[PDB]
Design an enzyme around this catalytic site. Structure first.
Site, PDB file in Angstrom:
ATOM      1  N   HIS A  40     -48.164  39.846 135.998  1.00 51.17           N
ATOM      2  CA  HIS A  40     -48.991  39.199 137.020  1.00 51.17           C
ATOM      3  C   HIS A  40     -48.699  39.725 138.436  1.00 51.17           C
ATOM      4  O   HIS A  40     -49.413  39.381 139.381  1.00 51.17           O
ATOM      5  CB  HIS A  40     -48.883  37.677 136.942  1.00 51.17           C
ATOM      6  CG  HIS A  40     -47.628  37.111 137.524  1.00 51.17           C
ATOM      7  ND1 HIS A  40     -47.490  36.848 138.866  1.00 51.17           N
ATOM      8  CD2 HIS A  40     -46.478  36.700 136.938  1.00 51.17           C
ATOM      9  CE1 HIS A  40     -46.300  36.317 139.086  1.00 51.17           C
ATOM     10  NE2 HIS A  40     -45.663  36.219 137.933  1.00 51.17           N
ATOM     11  N   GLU A  52     -32.126  46.494 149.237  1.00 49.53           N
ATOM     12  CA  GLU A  52     -32.548  45.545 150.268  1.00 49.53           C
ATOM     13  C   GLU A  52     -31.660  44.309 150.348  1.00 49.53           C
ATOM     14  O   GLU A  52     -31.221  43.786 149.329  1.00 49.53           O
ATOM     15  CB  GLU A  52     -33.986  45.076 150.005  1.00 49.53           C
ATOM     16  CG  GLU A  52     -35.060  46.133 150.268  1.00 49.53           C
ATOM     17  CD  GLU A  52     -35.397  46.263 151.742  1.00 49.53           C
ATOM     18  OE1 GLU A  52     -34.632  45.723 152.556  1.00 49.53           O
ATOM     19  OE2 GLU A  52     -36.419  46.895 152.094  1.00 49.53           O
ATOM     20  N   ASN A  54     -32.005  42.006 153.985  1.00 54.31           N
ATOM     21  CA  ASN A  54     -33.068  41.512 154.849  1.00 54.31           C
ATOM     22  C   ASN A  54     -34.277  42.427 154.696  1.00 54.31           C
ATOM     23  O   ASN A  54     -34.246  43.570 155.134  1.00 54.31           O
ATOM     24  CB  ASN A  54     -32.617  41.442 156.307  1.00 54.31           C
ATOM     25  CG  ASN A  54     -33.611  40.697 157.179  1.00 54.31           C
ATOM     26  OD1 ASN A  54     -34.825  40.909 157.078  1.00 54.31           O
ATOM     27  ND2 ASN A  54     -33.103  39.803 158.025  1.00 54.31           N
ATOM     28  N   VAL A  57     -35.732  44.097 158.032  1.00 51.47           N
ATOM     29  CA  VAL A  57     -34.871  44.933 158.872  1.00 51.47           C
ATOM     30  C   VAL A  57     -34.317  46.095 158.057  1.00 51.47           C
ATOM     31  O   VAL A  57     -33.868  45.894 156.936  1.00 51.47           O
ATOM     32  CB  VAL A  57     -33.679  44.109 159.409  1.00 51.47           C
ATOM     33  CG1 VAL A  57     -32.724  44.991 160.224  1.00 51.47           C
ATOM     34  CG2 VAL A  57     -34.177  42.925 160.236  1.00 51.47           C
ATOM     35  N   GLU A  62     -31.054  51.010 152.115  1.00 48.07           N
ATOM     36  CA  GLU A  62     -32.327  51.009 151.400  1.00 48.07           C
ATOM     37  C   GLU A  62     -32.724  52.379 150.871  1.00 48.07           C
ATOM     38  O   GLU A  62     -32.377  53.410 151.445  1.00 48.07           O
ATOM     39  CB  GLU A  62     -33.469  50.520 152.294  1.00 48.07           C
ATOM     40  CG  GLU A  62     -33.288  49.120 152.831  1.00 48.07           C
ATOM     41  CD  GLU A  62     -32.603  49.075 154.183  1.00 48.07           C
ATOM     42  OE1 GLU A  62     -32.009  50.082 154.616  1.00 48.07           O
ATOM     43  OE2 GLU A  62     -32.655  48.004 154.820  1.00 48.07           O
ATOM     44  N   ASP A  84     -45.860  38.402 129.835  1.00 47.10           N
ATOM     45  CA  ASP A  84     -45.889  38.657 131.285  1.00 47.10           C
ATOM     46  C   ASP A  84     -44.788  39.635 131.672  1.00 47.10           C
ATOM     47  O   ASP A  84     -43.754  39.251 132.221  1.00 47.10           O
ATOM     48  CB  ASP A  84     -45.761  37.342 132.054  1.00 47.10           C
ATOM     49  CG  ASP A  84     -46.026  37.492 133.544  1.00 47.10           C
ATOM     50  OD1 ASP A  84     -46.500  38.566 133.977  1.00 47.10           O
ATOM     51  OD2 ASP A  84     -45.764  36.511 134.284  1.00 47.10           O
ATOM     52  N   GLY A 175     -43.171  34.202 145.312  1.00 42.46           N
ATOM     53  CA  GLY A 175     -42.513  35.355 145.927  1.00 42.46           C
ATOM     54  C   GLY A 175     -41.307  35.831 145.138  1.00 42.46           C
ATOM     55  O   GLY A 175     -40.867  36.965 145.314  1.00 42.46           O
ATOM     56  N   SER A 177     -41.551  35.846 141.888  1.00 42.24           N
ATOM     57  CA  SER A 177     -42.288  36.416 140.769  1.00 42.24           C
ATOM     58  C   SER A 177     -41.869  37.832 140.463  1.00 42.24           C
ATOM     59  O   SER A 177     -41.768  38.650 141.369  1.00 42.24           O
ATOM     60  CB  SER A 177     -43.781  36.460 141.098  1.00 42.24           C
ATOM     61  OG  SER A 177     -44.350  35.180 141.024  1.00 42.24           O
ATOM     62  N   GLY A 178     -41.650  38.115 139.182  1.00 42.14           N
ATOM     63  CA  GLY A 178     -41.304  39.458 138.733  1.00 42.14           C
ATOM     64  C   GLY A 178     -39.821  39.767 138.792  1.00 42.14           C
ATOM     65  O   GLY A 178     -39.385  40.769 138.248  1.00 42.14           O
TER      66      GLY A 178
HETATM   67  C1  LIG Z   1     -45.648  28.154 141.574  1.00 36.30           C
HETATM   68  O1  LIG Z   1     -45.250  29.492 141.743  1.00 36.30           O
HETATM   69  C2  LIG Z   1     -44.217  29.951 141.061  1.00 36.30           C
HETATM   70  C3  LIG Z   1     -44.060  31.307 140.969  1.00 36.30           C
HETATM   71  C4  LIG Z   1     -42.991  31.787 140.281  1.00 36.30           C
HETATM   72  C5  LIG Z   1     -42.113  30.933 139.672  1.00 36.30           C
HETATM   73  C6  LIG Z   1     -42.259  29.589 139.759  1.00 36.30           C
HETATM   74  C7  LIG Z   1     -41.241  28.685 139.070  1.00 36.30           C
HETATM   75  N1  LIG Z   1     -41.068  27.403 139.704  1.00 36.30           N
HETATM   76  C8  LIG Z   1     -43.344  29.077 140.464  1.00 36.30           C
HETATM   77 CA   LIG Z   2     -33.882  45.906 154.676  1.00 40.33          CA
END
Ligand SMILES: COc1cccc(CN)c1
Ligand SMILES: [Ca+2]
Length: 223
Positions: A40, A52, A54, A57, A62, A84, A175, A177-178
């Site tokens: 996704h 990474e 920060n 910055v 990096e 996924d 954020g 995610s992945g």
């Molecule tokens: C709701 O958005 C999300 C994205 C990735 C992971 C999760 C797990 N709480 C939630």
């Molecule tokens: Ca950085």
């Protein structure tokens, strides 16, 4: 990451940021030229950012390397989020060192009760929004299949597991995610989905990486 801690700069050397003008997803370095992320997280124009802390910055450790190709799992279903997982190949090999390092794939599936490390640059609030710029970490146990299925009736496949806390307060979030779920030095999960973040009885759901080792190895060997 909600309810986590500041990891410390470069303490999670396999953690990558996927950048398309801005950080949009995490990923895990699994050798010098390949990253594992969530399907996704697929999009065009991905630059992989290694070393990474920060993400706003340039701190000196990096490596920025554009993706040459992305391979979404052939059975990925974007509605159910089954399968996924996606592989991203780097245009050039990363220079591996203490602060940029690959994470081993699992030889065995991790059991419920196993303690793992979840990390990312995602939202740190369960209500509203605050994005940290430094990498955040959370220690969390894998939950039983039964508790996971009870938390999300009709939605948990054999390619998913729950990790975190049924009481809420500590979870992955938008954020993250992945990104990685690492247990005993092996990549066991990928941040996939959930219902909001850190809510009671709605733990995070993660792609079960041990089911994909053959696909990952074979795909890497021919691409
Ligand atoms: C709701 O958005 C999300 C994205 C990735 C992971 C999760 C797990 N709480 C939630
Ligand atoms: Ca950085």
């Amino acid at each position: 990451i909600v309810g986590g801690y500041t990891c410390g700069a470069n303490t999670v050397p396999y953690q990558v940021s996927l950048n398309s003008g801005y950080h949009f997803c995490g990923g895990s370095l699994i050798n010098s030229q390949w990253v594992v992320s969530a399907a996704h997280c697929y999009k065009s124009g991905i630059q992989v950012r290694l070393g990474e802390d920060n993400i706003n910055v340039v701190e000196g450790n990096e490596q920025f390397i554009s993706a040459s190709k992305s391979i979404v799992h052939p059975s990925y279903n974007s509605n159910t989020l089954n399968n996924d997982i996606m592989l991203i190949k780097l245009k050039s090999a990363a220079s591996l060192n203490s602060r940029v390092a690959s994470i081993s794939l699992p030889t065995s599936c991790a059991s419920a009760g196993t303690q793992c490390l979840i990390s990312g640059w995602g939202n740190t609030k369960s209500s509203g929004t605050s994005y940290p710029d430094v990498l955040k970490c959370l220690k969390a146990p894998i939950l039983s299949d039964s508790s996971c299925k009870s938390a999300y009736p009709g939605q948990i496949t054999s390619n998913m597991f729950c990790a975190g806390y049924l009481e809420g307060g500590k979870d992955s979030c938008q954020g993250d995610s992945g990104g990685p779920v690492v247990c005993s030095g092996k990549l066991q999960g990928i941040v996939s989905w959930g219902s909001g973040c850190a809510q009671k009885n709605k733990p995070g759901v993660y792609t079960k990486v041990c089911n994909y080792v053959s696909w990952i190895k074979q795909t890497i060997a021919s691409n």
